[PDB]
Design a protein around this ligand. Structure first.
Ligand code: QG0
Length: 134
């Protein structure tokens, strides 16, 4: 109970850095990178008991995951990878690992001031995406 309270709400993307290079490193193709890089998603996070739901709504795609911390699940990502995901809380940071085709990427979500900061890492490449309350 109360684990992710500071994450809950409706959030709007306000800045992005290095996302094209992150997407390249993940293997996303040209057209998807261009269209996806234009999107300004809203991220809606909610908690009901032990189940966390993260929805992303954008002009590119609407996605939704629900999960229990530490419990692996199947995810189809916005760029159409079929991945196996596990999300844990590490020192107040939501840590989301995706595995597919022998590859791995980690997405960290943390509260910093009034922002929700999303750090996406693939090998040596990091993208930082900043959300504010909608
Ligand atoms: C990385 C998390 N994320 C944030 S933050 N905004 N959208 C996403 C979903 N990922 C994604 C979206 C489009 C193309 C490629 C990818 Cl990997």
């Amino acid at each position: 109970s109360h684990m992710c309270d500071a994450f809950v709400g409706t959030w709007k993307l306000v800045s992005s850095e290095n996302f094209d290079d992150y997407m390249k490193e993940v293997g996303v193709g040209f057209a998807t990178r261009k269209v996806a890089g234009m999107a300004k998603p809203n991220m809606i996070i909610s908690v009901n008991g032990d189940v966390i739901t993260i929805k992303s709504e954008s002009t590119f795609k609407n996605t939704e995951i629900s999960f229990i911390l530490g419990q692996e699940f199947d995810e189809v990502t916005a760029d159409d990878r079929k991945v196996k995901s596990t999300i844990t809380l590490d020192g107040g940071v939501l840590v989301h690992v995706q595995k597919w085709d022998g590859k791995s990427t980690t997405i960290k979500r943390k509260r910093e001031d009034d922002k929700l900061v999303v750090e996406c890492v693939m090998k040596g490449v990091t993208s930082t995406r900043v959300y504010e309350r909608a």
